[PDB]
Amino acid sequence: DLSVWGMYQHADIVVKCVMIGLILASVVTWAIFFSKSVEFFNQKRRLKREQQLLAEARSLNQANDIAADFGSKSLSLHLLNEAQNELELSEGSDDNEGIKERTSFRLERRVAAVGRQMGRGNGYLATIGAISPFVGLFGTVWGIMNSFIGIAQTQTTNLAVVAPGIAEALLATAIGLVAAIPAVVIYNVFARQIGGFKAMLGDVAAQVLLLQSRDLDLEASAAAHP
Amino acid sequence: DLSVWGMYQHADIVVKCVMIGLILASVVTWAIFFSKSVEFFNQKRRLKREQQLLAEARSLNQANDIAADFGSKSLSLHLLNEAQNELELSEGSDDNEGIKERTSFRLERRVAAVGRQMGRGNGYLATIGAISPFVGLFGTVWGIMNSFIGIAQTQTTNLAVVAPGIAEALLATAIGLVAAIPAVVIYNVFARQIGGFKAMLGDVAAQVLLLQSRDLDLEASAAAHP
Amino acid sequence: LSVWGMYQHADIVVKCVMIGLILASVVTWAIFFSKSVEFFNQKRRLKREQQLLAEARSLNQANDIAADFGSKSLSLHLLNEAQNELELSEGSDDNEGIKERTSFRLERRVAAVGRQMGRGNGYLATIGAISPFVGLFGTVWGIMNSFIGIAQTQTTNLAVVAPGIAEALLATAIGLVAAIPAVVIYNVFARQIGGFKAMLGDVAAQVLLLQSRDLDLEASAAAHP
Amino acid sequence: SVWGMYQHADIVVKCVMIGLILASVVTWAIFFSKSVEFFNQKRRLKREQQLLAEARSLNQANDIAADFGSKSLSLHLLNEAQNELELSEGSDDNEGIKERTSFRLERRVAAVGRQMGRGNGYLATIGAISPFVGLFGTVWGIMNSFIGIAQTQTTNLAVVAPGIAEALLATAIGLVAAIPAVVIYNVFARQIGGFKAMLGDVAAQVLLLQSRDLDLEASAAAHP
């Protein structure tokens, strides 16, 4: 034979389907990578700028005055709106402990939802990077099984007749490893990025929570004591 | 053939590049290990002497007068400063429970952030220790496959004309495992050491929380019930 | 020739693999013996202490029971932490504060004792999970040296492959001998540490219930003559 | 032919290939059934959640979800909140009411998760023990081959090739039966987790509505 560009041609039926299935796996891996990488870089840059602007907040009104201009798909604006909307709905309630508990609960749900939406896509990468070595192994086990069939039937010697069979059988697992290397590299990259992003988001949410709690306490005190 | 080192330059392009990639991965692993190991040792030592010094503080003011000279990068001084910061930002409140809730929230955020800032290169270590045997096996399979393609194109039924190719292939595999195993044991070592140091930080933060709670409750029980 | 003569004429790297794995085995067995004796003694003391404190009925009575449990008694460190908090918070009139701080300290210290018990388990886990790959490195070196051998000469007999096969068998045999007891022992010790941490948590819970019950009763009696 | 060597194997490779083909058939039956059920339940719950996100009180929420069927998980959750509010009548500790309600709702969400994960036991067990039953088939095949090589002392290693063919066929069947088990199991684990979080969000919505109503009503009744 000559190379993979010629060996894939006359390989087999089931070995050829294994090779095509693994090529499709690799293509979907690189598509996932490109899309998620550009979106992650965009979102993380935006949120890091917004947190650096919010770090100079001393009250929830001042934080809304800062973040009045953060576009419309800014996670920071969504969290500040959860806090403000809870304060709006509970207008008429005199249980500031209740207000704080409700807002903590809403922000917990919202940060979890953003985490899951960011992570959506990594199941493909995990399962590909985990099982493509085994699909390659099945391709080579079938190739070698057919090699032994060919040796048994019309009995022959001189491995110069079986060499193309073993070449075809190994090519399957070579494509397997080629398709399961970038899946694991990309999966680890994105696990680290998602972790860092969920942590930064939790920091912004905790900032909102501290601002609201501190404001409620100081208001109740300065209104009841004097 | 000749030797180990006299048989890594005579391999094909794919196998040579596989072996060079694995050697660079092993070098990166050892540099990461040495740097982060001296760092962890230093940090654990400083924190232990700080915790010893503080374990004999009865008030938050006495703890802050002990830690008035721990330095600038002192994790313990950061925690005491966060406790004092919430307590002086909420000045005017009367919800001691609110003050303690904000303080505990902030200190646990800070402890977790230090943990994640310590686990920095471990992504490199895990990726290397997970994909390096695969790069070794891609090398060995490409080597054996090239060897059989050559044996079929040359039509030589011997085995002495094919043994060196298999030698270099299995060499690439052994180097794959050499680059994999140390990375994995060092990743486990660093995960354990990071867990231990995070428990030590948790204990210092717990000390701060108890000092603050006692201070607040004793101040209240003295000023309200003479 | 025998297995000893097989080891004597193996490659340098295969001999270093085998030395590393036999030393890993020796450290596994030293760990097993030390940790086994310490677990037996610790769990015996603790079980006796808990079965004594099952009849406490009050924190003062529990203190007078455990007043002489030696000094290594974990069930004495916990009682003295509850009492130490109840004494550092004298003058405070908030009882929920006292209960909260005591519970915090006791969870803290139970976690500390657990982390001290699980000391060496990291090493056992590392060996038991890695050693098959050091064995496989030895095997691959053995096969590769067999092939360099059959390439040096031009023939392929049993005599030219015997060295590679000796290496491939011996290296992975010691791999298995060093990775089977590491897994057995790591598992028995993880199970025993789980059991002991549970027993310790149950004594901690006794201390918490006694303290809290006593605080509530004394406050009720003080507020209602 | 691949089908002509299934009978060639003698006994304990044939009764391993039958076992693994049955395992694969059961795997795919489980997949089709559970996947249709998950799609249906997730569609219904998503419709009901985005239909309830426009409710401002528990009264209006029961008005909305008055007709969601009977297998409606959102209806189960709303009725547990209202059942708690009804059993605790005559009480005055609204914090107690909220505590008990949240307790029951969390128990209920976990119960629905566990009731959905029913069969993933088979998927896990098959994905774990199928490569080993295949490999036991192949080791038995090669052992039987080397035993047959000694009775008739056929010193040629060109005629015992079908024995190794059967051994490797048992291993390939082991992998065919073992890989879809692992893939499908991971997919179902992940999909159950996602649906469980969406259900937790509907539960959180019920909890927020109840708490808000309780506090508003108590404050209004205390301060006329």
Binding site: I194 | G119, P133 | - | -
Partner: peptide, 29 residues
């Protein structure tokens, strides 16, 4: 930060599977 892959998985049975085809017809020829 994430559920990373730190596993060291090596399904290279395919190699020793090809090594054995070699030695099957290598000596008896």
């Amino acid at each position: 930060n994430g559920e990373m892959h730190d596993i060291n998985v090596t399904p290279f049975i395919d190699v020793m599977l090809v090594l054995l085809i070699i030695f099957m017809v290598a000596a008896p020829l």
